[PDB]
Design a protein around this ligand. Structure first.
Ligand SMILES: [Zn+2]
Ligand SMILES: [Zn+2]
Ligand SMILES: [Zn+2]
Length: 178
């Protein structure tokens, strides 16, 4: 196995996947690494199994159809993995915890949002459709762009949104377009 966490790239108290060489901090994995379960398979492995059991699940889909899906176990897993892929980028630190807004010439967003809030919401089964999760994720970046205006810091929103959107197209097999 790897000797660093796949998500944050630090050593520490690591749980090792039994079916691949990845390792994780307890709360870096999503869902948090399960108490018992020998063997244990990480989220990467669980997602790969879905694809292998239903190869046709990789044919292209329309985003509008994916968003209306109910959050059954496979869609719950897919959103957890997508959230994890965002946390894998170090620039997610800016969006992880609860923000506050006091900048001359700007007003804070009406509906603040952050990664750890989305994480709790997924854990508590608060989303009934994929749309709920995707809306909250896109709201993080939209709030950031609106608040920071012309400050160059706005670019961090664009950057982390791009990681989100590329991973959303990959995980949910969104039909490729120009
Ligand atoms: Zn970690
Ligand atoms: Zn694995
Ligand atoms: Zn199938």
């Amino acid at each position: 196995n790897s000797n660093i966490c796949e998500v944050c790239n630090k050593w520490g108290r690591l749980f090792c996947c039994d079916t691949c060489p990845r390792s994780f901090h307890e709360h870096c994995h999503i869902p948090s690494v399960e108490a018992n379960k020998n063997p244990w398979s990480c989220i990467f492995c669980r997602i790969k199994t879905i694809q292998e059991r239903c190869p046709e699940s990789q044919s292209g889909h329309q985003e509008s159809e994916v968003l209306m899906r109910q959050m059954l176990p496979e869609e719950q897993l897919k959103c957890e993995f997508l959230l994890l892929k965002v946390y894998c980028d170090s620039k997610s630190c800016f969006f992880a915890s609860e923000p506050y807004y006091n900048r001359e010439g700007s007003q804070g967003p009406q509906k603040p949002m952050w990664l750890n809030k989305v994480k709790t919401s997924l854990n508590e089964q608060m989303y009934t459709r994929v749309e709920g999760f995707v809306q909250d994720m896109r709201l993080i970046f939209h709030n950031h762009k609106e608040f920071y205006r012309e400050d160059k810091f706005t670019r961090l929103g664009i950057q982390v949104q791009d990681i989100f959107e590329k991973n959303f197209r990959n995980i949910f097999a969104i039909q490729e377009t120009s």
